[PDB]
Every structure is written in structure tokens, then in C-alpha cells.
Amino acid sequence: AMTVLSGHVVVCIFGDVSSALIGLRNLVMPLRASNFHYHELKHIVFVGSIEYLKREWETLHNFPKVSILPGTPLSRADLRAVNINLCDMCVILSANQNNIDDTSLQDKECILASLNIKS
Amino acid sequence: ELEALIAEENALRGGYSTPQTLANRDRCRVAQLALLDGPFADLGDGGCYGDLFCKALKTYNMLCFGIYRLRDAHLSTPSQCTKRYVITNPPYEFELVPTDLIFCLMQFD
Incomplete structure (x- = not known):
């Protein structure tokens, strides 16, 4: 909260120890591309489980420009801490998407995080 | 407001009281009182359950609910069974043993 983050990037992750590794290096690489300047380079914070x-x-x-907030992407207090309002783009990713075998769980988290942020 | 604070915090917190905060003691509290002993024990052997709760009203506005009487309290053969069973909304002409617990609500503290 005291870290003022305006126009930044938050990433929501539904990961665990049983979930497969997504691989976020490919995600964070073109954010740090040299076609912009270091002052222009955005800050990234990852919200989720500290196990993943x-x-x-x-x-x-x-x-x-990379932070980590352990917790839960569904936590409205954590979203208010990372200032999702001022955040340029929230990215909701799911890691358990290819271990669950039911639409009821398929993207269920992503839909909840989106609806909580919209609400 | 408590539900919104729950949805925002997921942990109840403490705050400094005010007179409006101290006005949140005004929940008319649930209680279970005894009929054998107390200021209402002056009748314990009647049958005017209606007069019993009207005395409760005109005494402390104590809303009765129903009689938590023992199972064999309706019997003449004395057993040693302390298992009581509830009775919801007793009528006006319902009897009354002194060995009784009552479901009553006194006014908020």
C-alpha cells in the first residue's frame, strides 16, 4: 500500500504445489524489452500462493521491477493493497487448468476474480 | 455493514467505542431461566400460562417462548430422568410444574 504503484501491472495466479509450472519468464520478457526506456518500464506484482x-x-x-504478494487473488484487501484501480492491466492466470476435469472448476477461479474486480 | 466489512477484511477488528457504538448492546438477549426459584417463581403450580407470560410482560417485558419441561415431569411415577424436552408456543390453559426451565427473552443489556 505504501509502495505507490500507478499505471503498473498486477498478475493474478491460481497456483499451488499440485499445479503444473506455467512459466512466466516468457510473459515478463517483452515487458523488459529495450524498445522503451527504464523509466518507461512498468512494475509487475504477482498475487497468489507463496508455494507456487x-x-x-x-x-x-x-x-x-518485479514484486510478489503472497496471499489470494480473490482477496479484496490484497487487491486494494496492490491498487488494481491504478493498475494498467490485471492478468488473471490459472495453473490448475490442466489437472481439473470439469467445467465447474474450468476457469471457475478466473471468472470469480474477474467478477470481484468488476464489483 | 458487518457483512461488507467481512467481505473487505476477512477478519473482525476492534474499534474505539462511541455512544452510537455503545448503542450496539441493544440486542434483546436470549436466555433460559428457571421456574422453581426466582422473582417469577411466585407461581409454579398454576395452569395459567397466559397469566404467567402476562406477568412476565408487566414485570420486565420478558417474552416467553416455550416450556422446557422434563420428559417424566408429566408423570405421577417419579423417575430420575433429567432429560428435558422443548414445547413451542404453549397455550393459555397449559399447566406448570415448579421443576421447570423456561425459554425467555429479557430486554437488551
């Missing part, structure tokens, strides 16, 4: 964040942090360490 620990599973992916061994890949996710060589990159600037």
Missing part, C-alpha cells in the same frame, strides 16, 4: 511462487521463483529472479 516458491516453485517458480528459481526461474523468477533475474528480472527488475
Whole structure:
């Protein structure tokens, strides 16, 4: 909250230890492309479970302007902390999408996070 | 307001009281009182359950609910069964043993 983030990027992740590794390096690479300047380079914060964040942090360490908020993307308090209002783009990703075998769970989280942010 | 604070915080918090905050003691509290002993024990052997709750009204506006009487309290053969069973909305002409617990609501503290 004290970290003022305006026009930035928040990423929501529904990951766990049982979930497969998505791979976010390909996501965060063209954000740090040299066709802009370092002042223009946006800040990224990842919201989700610190277990999945620990599973992916061994890949996710060589990159600037990157934060991590452990918690839950459904948490309205966490969204207010990361200032989703001022955030340029929220990205809702799901990691359990190819282990669950039911539309009831298929994208269920993504739909909930979208509806909470809209509400 | 509490539900909105729940949806925003997911943890109840504490705040500094005010007179409007202290006005949130005004929930007319549930209670279970005894009929054998107390200021209402002056009748315990009647049958005017209507007069019983009207005395409860004119005493403390104590809204009765129903009689939590023992199972064998309606019997003449004395057993040692302390299992009580509830009775909802007793009529005006319902009897009354002194060994009784009552479902009553006194005014908010």
C-alpha cells in the first residue's frame, strides 16, 4: 500500500504445489524489452500462493521491477493493497487448468476474480 | 455493514467505542431461566400460562417462548430422568410444574 504503484501491472495466479509450472519468464520478457526506456518500464506484482511462487521463483529472479504478494487473488484487501484501480492491466492466470476435469472448476477461479474486480 | 466489512477484511477488528457504538448492546438477549426459584417463581403450580407470560410482560417485558419441561415431569411415577424436552408456543390453559426451565427473552443489556 505504501509502495505507490500507478499505471503498473498486477498478475493474478491460481497456483499451488499440485499445479503444473506455467512459466512466466516468457510473459515478463517483452515487458523488459529495450524498445522503451527504464523509466518507461512498468512494475509487475504477482498475487497468489507463496508455494507456487516458491516453485517458480528459481526461474523468477533475474528480472527488475518485479514484486510478489503472497496471499489470494480473490482477496479484496490484497487487491486494494496492490491498487488494481491504478493498475494498467490485471492478468488473471490459472495453473490448475490442466489437472481439473470439469467445467465447474474450468476457469471457475478466473471468472470469480474477474467478477470481484468488476464489483 | 458487518457483512461488507467481512467481505473487505476477512477478519473482525476492534474499534474505539462511541455512544452510537455503545448503542450496539441493544440486542434483546436470549436466555433460559428457571421456574422453581426466582422473582417469577411466585407461581409454579398454576395452569395459567397466559397469566404467567402476562406477568412476565408487566414485570420486565420478558417474552416467553416455550416450556422446557422434563420428559417424566408429566408423570405421577417419579423417575430420575433429567432429560428435558422443548414445547413451542404453549397455550393459555397449559399447566406448570415448579421443576421447570423456561425459554425467555429479557430486554437488551
